[PDB]
Amino acid sequence: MIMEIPAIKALSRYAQWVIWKKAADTKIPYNPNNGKKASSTDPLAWGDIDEAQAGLVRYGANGLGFVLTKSDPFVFIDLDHVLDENKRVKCEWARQLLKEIKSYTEISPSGDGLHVVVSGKLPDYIKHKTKFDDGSALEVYESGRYMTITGEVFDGRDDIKELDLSILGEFAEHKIDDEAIIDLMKRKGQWPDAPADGDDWSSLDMSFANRLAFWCGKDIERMDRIFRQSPLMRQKWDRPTAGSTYGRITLKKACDFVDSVYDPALRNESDCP
Numbered sequence: 214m215i216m217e218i219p220a221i222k223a224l225s226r227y228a229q230w231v232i233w234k235k236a237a238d239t240k241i242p243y244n245p246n247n248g249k250k251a252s253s254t255d256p257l258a259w260g261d262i263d264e265a266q267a268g269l270v271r272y273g274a275n276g277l278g279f280v281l282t283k284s285d286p287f288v289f290i291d292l293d294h295v296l297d298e299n300k301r302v303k304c305e306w307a308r309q310l311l312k313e314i315k316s317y318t319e320i321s322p323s324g325d326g327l328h329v330v331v332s333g334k335l336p337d338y339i340k341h342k343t344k345f346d347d348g349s350a351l352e353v354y355e356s357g358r359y360m361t362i363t364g365e366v367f368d369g370r371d372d373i374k375e376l377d378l379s380i381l382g383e384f385a386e387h388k389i390d391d392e393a394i395i396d397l398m399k400r401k402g403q404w405p406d407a408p409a410d411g412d413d414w415s416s417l418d419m420s421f422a423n424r425l426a427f428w429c430g431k432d433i434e435r436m437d438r439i440f441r442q443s444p445l446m447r448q449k450w451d452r453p454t455a456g457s458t459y460g461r462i463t464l465k466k467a468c469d470f471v472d473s474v475y476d477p478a479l480r481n482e483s484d485c486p
């Protein structure tokens with residue numbers, strides 16, 4: 214079955230294969246030759262498909278993976294949550310993409326998404342991940358990452374095709390440190406958990422806003438960017454309230470309340486983790 218798929222034979226012309234196992238809610242890639250965790254950028258942590266299939270058996274893994282590199286011709290298009298229970302496409306944007314990008318297509322391991330593998334290059338003005346309102350999403354990659362390989366061919370599309378992908382711009386959002394201070398607040402116990410029922414969410418907002426004022430140097434714009442990636446973000450944040458929004462009033466009250474400020478001369482703080 215899987216060894217008879219033309220796309221698999223094309224991919225098997227590369228020693229960029231891994232195996233993966235499901236751990237928690239994510240799929241971890243493994244070196245198929247020693248069973249250790251595999252880096253997506255170390256070529257000697259991978260194997261050819263013979264080694265990957267033997268390691269899949271040897272270590273009891275859940276499936277094969279393939280690591281994309283800038284040098285190989287492959288592009289990975291991931292259609293998240295686009296299939297119904299009968300493995301039929303339920304998102305109109307996804308139905309359109311498949312009409313316009315015809316190449317190797319397989320059902321993803323969870324059974325409700327699709328993988329499309331194309332020979333080409335991505336447009337430079339599209340974002341790696343686009344999320345839609347119905348919970349579906351579009352992810353595109355051509356390097357620095359592995360894809361799971363299921364061999365569950367969709368609509369008989371078993372062959373990788375050479376295709377220009379500029380028209381991916383119809384579907385992906387167009388594009389034109391914060392993560393540092395995030396990581397800083399996280400490792401110092403200052404990053405909030407998602408609210409549980411019974412919590413005064415608005416009070417969680419202010420406590421986190423105060424911590425943001427310190428760690429962000431009262432940079433209101435940074436504070437806002439940072440809050441939107443936190444488990445306390447909700448639609449109320451952008452709610453018009455009096456002269457502005459609930460979020461903007463919260464952040465300004467935080468800036469007025471906190472006295473101390475973290476300056477990267479490594480200073481420390483009023484609020485405890």
Ligand SMILES: [Mg+2]
Nearest residue numbers: 292293321326
């Ligand atoms: Mg998927």
Ligand SMILES: [Mg+2]
Nearest residue numbers: 282285287355
């Ligand atoms: Mg590539």
